[PDB]
Amino acid sequence: GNRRIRSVGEMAENQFRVGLVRVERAVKERLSLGDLDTLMPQDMINAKPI
Amino acid sequence: MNLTELKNTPVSELITLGENMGLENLARMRKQDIIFAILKQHAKSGEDIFGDGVLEILQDGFGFLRSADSSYLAGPDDIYVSPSQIRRFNLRTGDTISGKIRPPKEGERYFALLKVNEVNFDKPENARNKILFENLTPLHANSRLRMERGNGSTEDLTARVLDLASPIGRGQRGLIVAPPKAGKTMLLQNIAQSIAYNHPDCVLMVLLID
């Protein structure tokens, strides 16, 4: 009653969220010093961490 | 604060200005480095810097603004043009760009472009809508580009003989066939002088390779 089962679903959600926050850090660092109507939302999210 | 204005200034005045601004000894320094240091010191005060040049888009996607006084040679004072702005304004190789620039920050080597003010010596709203050169309808030479001076000078004989032999019009595609040691230099000089005298409105460009 004190031990759980963590299958592939949660184990993948955790890693996906880790990659997502690693991307969000750089996205916020860029948008904090960004210019409105200068870049598209596709040139500010590096897909490499995910 | 324009790049060409500082490029036209002599070395002595730039050295004096740099010494008045309170920087490192500029006597043992290149003129380009002096201009770079002056631009850095002037931008540290918060003022804006402006530049211009011909765009040269690289194969990767970025580009620089070459200068005409250096025969479009790769210089340290070239203005970096991000591919984002190229994709936003549909810029191509040859477009004259004039806008505000900033000195390179830590880890950069070239000036960056913030806002473009004038494109091809015209408003960007007129350059965004334009017909490509590959779509223009060709035609034969219609307007007459007379080469005769008319001042009665002794050098006008060459222009008179050229007009009597082969008149030149707008859009002409000719050839000056001549063996070496014939007088091509003087003939080209006379042609250029007659073009600059008779038709000063046309854009004259002399290309001398090798």
Give a concise summary.
Chain B: ATP binds at residues 169-174, 181-186. Chain A is mainly α.
3D architecture notes:
The structure is cut from a larger assembly and holds chains A (50 residues) and B (210 residues). With 50 residues, chain A is mainly α. Chain A has one helix at 8-32. The termini of chain A are far apart. By secondary structure, chain B is of the alpha+beta class. Chain B has helices at residues 3-8, 11-21, 31-44, 83-89, 124-127, 156-165, 184-198; strands at 49-57, 63-66, 79-80, 96-102, 111-119, 144-145, 168-169. In chain B, the strands form two sheets. In chain B, strands 2-1-4-5-3 form a five-stranded mixed beta sheet. Chain B has a two-stranded antiparallel sheet with strand order 6-7. In chain B, strand 1 (49-57) and strand 2 form a beta hairpin. In chain B, helix 2 packs parallel to helix 3. The radius of gyration of chain B is 22 Å and the shape is globular. The chains hardly touch. Chain A: It comes from Escherichia coli (strain K12).
Radius of gyration of chain A: 16 Å
Percent helix of chain A? 40-55%
- Structural class label of chain A: mainly alpha
What's the overall geometry of chain B?
A: globular
N-end to C-end Cα span of chain A: 35 Å
Strand content of chain A: under 5%
Report the order of strands and helices of chain B. HHHEEEHEEHEHEH
User: What percentage of the residues of chain B does DSSP assign to strands (E)?
Assistant: 15-25%
By oligomeric state, this entry counts as: part of a larger assembly
Shape of chain A: elongated
Please give the number of β-strands of chain A.
0
**Residue share in helix of chain B:** 25-40%
Number of strand segments of chain B: 7
Protein name (chain B): Transcription termination factor Rho
Keywords (chain B): ATP-binding, Helicase, Hydrolase, Nucleotide-binding, RNA-binding, Transcription, Transcription regulation, Transcription termination
GO biological process, one term (chain B): DNA-templated transcription termination
Family (chain B): Belongs to the Rho family.
